[PDB]
Amino acid sequence: KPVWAPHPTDGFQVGNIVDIGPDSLTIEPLNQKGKTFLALINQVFPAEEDSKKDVEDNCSLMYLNEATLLHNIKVRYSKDRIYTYVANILIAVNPYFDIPKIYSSETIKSYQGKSLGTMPPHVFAIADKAFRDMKVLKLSQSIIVSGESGAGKTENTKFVLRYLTESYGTGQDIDDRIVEANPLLEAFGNAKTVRNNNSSRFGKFVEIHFNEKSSVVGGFVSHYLLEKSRICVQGKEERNYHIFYRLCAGASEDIRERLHLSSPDNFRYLNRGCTRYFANKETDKQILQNRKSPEYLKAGSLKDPLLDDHGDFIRMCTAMKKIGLDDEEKLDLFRVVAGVLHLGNIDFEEAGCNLKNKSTQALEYCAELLGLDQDDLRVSLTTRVMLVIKVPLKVEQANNARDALAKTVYSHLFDHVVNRVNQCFPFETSSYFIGVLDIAGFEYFEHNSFEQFCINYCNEKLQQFFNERILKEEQELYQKEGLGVNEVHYVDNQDCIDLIEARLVGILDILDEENRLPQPSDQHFTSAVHQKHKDHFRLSIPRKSKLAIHRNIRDDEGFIIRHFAGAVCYETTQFVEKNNDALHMSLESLICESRDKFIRELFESKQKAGKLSFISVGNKFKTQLNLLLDKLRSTGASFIRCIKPNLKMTSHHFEGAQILSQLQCSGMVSVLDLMQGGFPSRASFHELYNMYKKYMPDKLARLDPRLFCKALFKALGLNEIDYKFGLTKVFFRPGKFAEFDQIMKSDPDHLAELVKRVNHWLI
C-alpha cells in the first residue's frame, strides 16, 4: 500500500493513494491523516515494503526509482554508510566529518582483489575494479569523480590515488610522491569559496602509469583552467589561493622580513576577501601577532576539520622535502608569491597617470622579488607601446596592466608547480594507466561569467560521454542481442556542444573574432552570438528566462544556454577581457627578460609594435578538453557521483530535495529507468559453460555452450522472466545472477536430481 509522493524539503514523503485520477493522484501523507494533496502521476513512486532496511546496491531494491534510491542512500547516510552502488556506478555522500578507520591501511588491504559486492560499497572497490579490468582486459582505465562544489570529488580522488599507490606500488617511498604532491597543488590551486573551504579552482586528470607486470612506473597530472579572477580580488567570505595565507601564517620571521610580508589586510590582493586564518585554540597560539589581521583579532579564526593555515604550511614544506623539492626552489616559489602580493599594492593617480608616492616601497619590493628594474616596471605599468609611441595609460588602464601581470605571473607559477610535480615521478615508458578525473561540475549562481561558461561547456562534453557509455552502449547491447527491452531515451546534447565549440560559427570562435576586432566589445560579441544562432534550440536572449531575476538583462548583455542539467543565464560583461591569456608586449617583454633565472624559466617553456597580443582562453581550453576526451574514449570508464548533503558543511544533515536535485541533474533518473527494465548482470554461454560444467553430470558437458545453459536453466527451474537468452549471452535481470550462483553452489547430488527430473537422459 505505501508510496513515495513529493515533499518540498525532503524530496519525497511516505503516503497512501486514496484516489487515482486521469491526470493526478490524491495522497494522504502518513499518520497526518485528514490532510490530502494532489501529485502528478509521474511524481508518485512505489516504496519499499521494509522502510528500515537498506541495500548496498540500489539494483537490489524491489522498485528502483528516484524516490527509492533517495530513501536507501538516506538510511545508509544516517548509519555513516556514505557509499552505495547503482550497478557499477558509486554514489558517495559527503559525511562532512572523519568516519573512523574507513580509509585505514587495513581497510585498503581488505579491498584488494575483491569483486564488487564481495565487500561493502567503497571508493577502494571502484579503484580495485579499475586495476583488475586494466590487468585482465589489457586496456587503460579512467575513474570520473563528479559532483558539485563541496561534494567530495577532491577527497575521493585522493582516496583512489592513495589506495592504488599503497596497493599496487613498488613499496619504495617513490609511490608516496603521487600522494605527497596533492598538498602542493592545493596550496597554489585551492581557495576558500562560500560553498567549499578547500575549493579546487582548477580541474585535473591524474594518471597513474603501469608496466606490463601491472606495477606503478610513475604518474602524470594535466591541469585545466586555473581561475585567474581570484588572484586579485575576492568576495568578503572568500579567500585567494591557500599559499598566500599559509605563507603569512607560517613563514619564519626570517622568510617574513626577506619577502617583506605582513598580515593579509596589508595587501590589496587579499584585503577585499576574508583575511582570517583557519586555526584552532592550539594553532592560533603558534601564529605571531604581526601576522594577524584586525578582522582575525575581532572575529577569531575560521573553522574547518582539516584546513589549518599554520599547520598546512608545515605539511606543505614536508611535502616539498618528501617529493625532492630543494630549499632554493621552495624560496623561489615564495618569492614569486610575495612578488605578486607587492605588485598588487602599487597605486596610480591622474597626472596620463603616475605612481602614488605611497606606492614607492611596493614598487621596490615587487621589482626586487620579480628581478626587474623599478623604472622598467613603472614605465610598463603606466604606458603602453603603439604604432613605436609610448602612449600614457589612464589610472584604470594602469590598474588593469598591474592585475594582468599578477594573473600571468601566478598562472605561470602554477604551471611550473604542476610541471615540477610531474618531474618528481616521471617514467620512460608505460603499458597502461589508471586516470582519475577531478573537475568542477555543472553549477549556476546568481551571476554566471566566462569562468562558469567554460566549466559548463566542459560538463556538457563529459555528460555526453557518460550518456554514451552508460545509456547508449548498454541499450545497443540489448538491441544487438534482441532482448526487446523498453527503450530509455535521453536528450542528445551534441547541438549544445556545437553551439559553443564549432569552428567559425561556435560561441568560442565568435568571442575570439571579437578579441581580434579594432575595438572589441562584449555587446558586439553578444549580438553576434544572438544574430548567428537566433533560431538555435539551446540559445536564448536573457528576456526569455524562466527566472524573473534575469529579465532586465539586455539582449547584448547576456545569453541563456540550455545545458543538459538546466538553463544557465550568462552575463557577458568581461567575456572579451577574460578570453585573453596574453599580456601587452611591454609587460610580456618586461617579465620574460627578468634578471632572475627562475622567473625567466616561468616563461621559457616575438610580438611586433602594432601587432595584436591575443591568446584564446576558450580555444586553449577546447584543445586540452579534446585531448582529455580522446584519452577517456580510449579507456574503460568508472563513475563516482559525489553528493553534497547540505549547504552548511554539517554532518548528519541530509537535505532530501537538494540531494534529489543533484541525482536528477547528473542524469541518474535515466540510468534508473534503464536499469529497472534492463539486465545489468550478464555472462556468455561459454563463460557459464566453462565455470559451471564440472558441477553438473558429465553428459551436460557434451552439449554446446548455448544448449548446456538451456538444459541447466530448465533443471534449476529458474523463472523465465528473471533471465533472458540473447544471441551470445544469458542476460540476468537486476539482482538475479546472485540467485543463480547461489543454487550452483548447492549439493552436486541435488543438482544431478534436478537434471534427472527434466531429462533423465542426461544422467
Ligand X SMILES: Nc1ncnc2c1ncn2[C@@H]1O[C@H](COP(=O)(O)OP(=O)(O)O)[C@@H](O)[C@H]1O
Question: Where on the chain is the footprint of ligand X (CB under 6 A)?
Answer: 94-96, 98, 147, 149-155, 196-200, 305-306, 642
Query: Choosing among ligand X, ligand BEF, none, which partner's interface includes residue 305 (Cβ < 5 to 8 Å by kind)?
Result: ligand X
Q: Which of 150, 218, 371, 726 is catalytic?
A: 150
Q: Which of 329, 364, 443, 687 is catalytic?
A: 443
Closest contact distance (angstroms) between CB of 41 and ligand X is 35
Q: Would you give the distance in Å from CA 262 to the centre of its chain?
A: 34
Q: Which stretch binds ligand BEF (CB under 6 A): 194-202, 252-260, 284-292, 303-311?
A: 194-202
Tell which residue, 347, 356, 327, 348, has the closest CA to residue 258.
327
Distances (CA, A) of 17 to 29, 44, 69: 9, 9, 20
What angle, rounded to 10 degrees, do the helices at 182-189 and 395-423 form?
A: 170
Give 616's DSSP letter: B
Closest contact distance (angstroms) between CB of 438 and ligand BEF is 7
Per the CB < 8 A criterion, the answer to whether 249 and 313 are in contact is yes
Closest contact distance (angstroms) between CB of 641 and ligand BEF is 14
Report the SS3 class of residue 71: helix
Query: Choosing among ligand X, ligand BEF, none, which partner's interface includes residue 142 (Cβ < 5 to 8 Å by kind)?
Result: none
Q: Which of 200, 515, 635, 666 is catalytic?
A: 200
Verify cis geometry, omega within 30 degrees of 0, for the bond prior to 33: yes
Q: Contact between 196 and ligand BEF (CB under 6 A)?
A: yes
Place of cell 570508464: 637
Cα–Cα–Cα angle for 97, 305, 74, nearest 5°? 20
Nearer of residues 648 and 694 to ligand X, judged by Cβ: 648
Nearer of residues 128 and 155 to ligand X, judged by Cβ: 155
Nearer of residues 199 and 293 to ligand BEF, judged by Cβ: 199
Query: Choosing among ligand BEF, ligand X, none, which partner's interface includes residue 493 (Cβ < 5 to 8 Å by kind)?
Result: none
Helix (H) or strand (E) holding 256: helix 253-258
Residue 415: CB atoms within 10 A of its CB come to: 15
Query: Choosing among ligand BEF, ligand X, none, which partner's interface includes residue 13 (Cβ < 5 to 8 Å by kind)?
Result: none
Distances (CA, A) of 428 to 88, 211, 220, 291: 33, 10, 12, 45
Q: Which of 15, 273, 339, 441 is catalytic?
A: 441
Distances (CA, A) of 497 to 459, 501, 560: 10, 6, 14
Nearer of residues 197 and 234 to ligand X, judged by Cβ: 197
Distances (CA, A) of 546 to 445, 446, 447, 551: 15, 13, 15, 9
Interface pick for ligand BEF out of 43, 110, 149, 646 (rule CB under 6 A): 149
Q: Is 149 one of the catalytic residues? A: yes
Give the 3-state secondary structure of 575-611: HHHHCECCCCHHHHHHHHCCCCHHHHHHCCCCCCCCC
Q: Is 151 annotated as a binding residue?
A: yes
Q: Which of 199, 380, 459, 493 is catalytic?
A: 199
Residue 749: CB atoms within 10 A of its CB come to: 8
Query: Choosing among ligand BEF, ligand X, none, which partner's interface includes residue 409 (Cβ < 5 to 8 Å by kind)?
Result: none
Q: Contact between 197 and ligand BEF (CB under 6 A)?
A: no
Q: Contact between 624 and ligand BEF (CB under 6 A)?
A: no
Give the neighbor-by-neighbor strand order of the sheet with 566-571: 539-540, 558-563, 566-571
CA–CA separation, 268 vs 727, rounded Å?
Answer: 69
Q: Is 155 annotated as a binding residue?
A: yes
Sites for ligand BEF among residues 430-459 (CB under 6 A): 440
Q: Contact between 153 and ligand BEF (CB under 6 A)?
A: yes
Q: Is 515 one of the catalytic residues? A: no
Closest contact distance (angstroms) between CB of 404 and ligand X is 28
Q: How many residues does the chain have?
A: 763
Nearer of residues 203 and 656 to ligand X, judged by Cβ: 203
Q: Is 438 annotated as a binding residue?
A: yes
Q: Is 441 one of the catalytic residues? A: yes
CA–CA separation, 525 vs 558, rounded Å?
Answer: 10
Q: Is 200 annotated as a binding residue?
A: yes
Q: Is 117 annotated as a binding residue?
A: no
- Within 8 A by CB and 6+ apart from 145, the residues are 153, 156, 157, 160, 436, 437, 438, 640, 642
Closest contact distance (angstroms) between CB of 277 and ligand X is 16
Query: Choosing among ligand BEF, ligand X, none, which partner's interface includes residue 152 (Cβ < 5 to 8 Å by kind)?
Result: ligand X
Q: Is 581 annotated as a binding residue?
A: no
Nearer of residues 249 and 440 to ligand X, judged by Cβ: 440
CA–CA separation, 763 vs 751, rounded Å?
Answer: 11
What angle, rounded to 10 degrees, do the helices at 395-423 and 374-382 form?
A: 120
Nearer of residues 146 and 430 to ligand BEF, judged by Cβ: 146
Closest contact distance (angstroms) between CB of 150 and ligand X is 5
Nearer of residues 210 and 414 to ligand X, judged by Cβ: 414
CA–CA separation, 688 vs 718, rounded Å?
Answer: 15
Breaks, C-N > 2.5 A, in the chain lie after 351, 387, 605
The identity of residue 117, as a single letter, is G
Q: Is 200 one of the catalytic residues? A: yes
The identity of residue 22, as a single letter, is P
Nearer of residues 312 and 512 to ligand BEF, judged by Cβ: 312
Query: Choosing among ligand X, ligand BEF, none, which partner's interface includes residue 147 (Cβ < 5 to 8 Å by kind)?
Result: ligand X
Longest Cα–Cα distance in the chain: 107
Q: Is 196 one of the catalytic residues? A: yes
Q: Which of 146, 165, 196, 408 is catalytic?
A: 196
Closest contact distance (angstroms) between CB of 83 and ligand X is 9
Closest contact distance (angstroms) between CB of 253 and ligand BEF is 33
Active-site positions? 149-150, 154, 196, 199-200, 441, 443
Residues in contact with ligand BEF by the rule CB under 6 A? 149-150, 153-154, 196, 199-200, 440
Q: From the annotation, which residues make up the binding site?
A: 94, 98, 103, 147-155, 196, 200, 438
Q: From the annotation, which residues make up the binding site for ATP?
A: 147-154
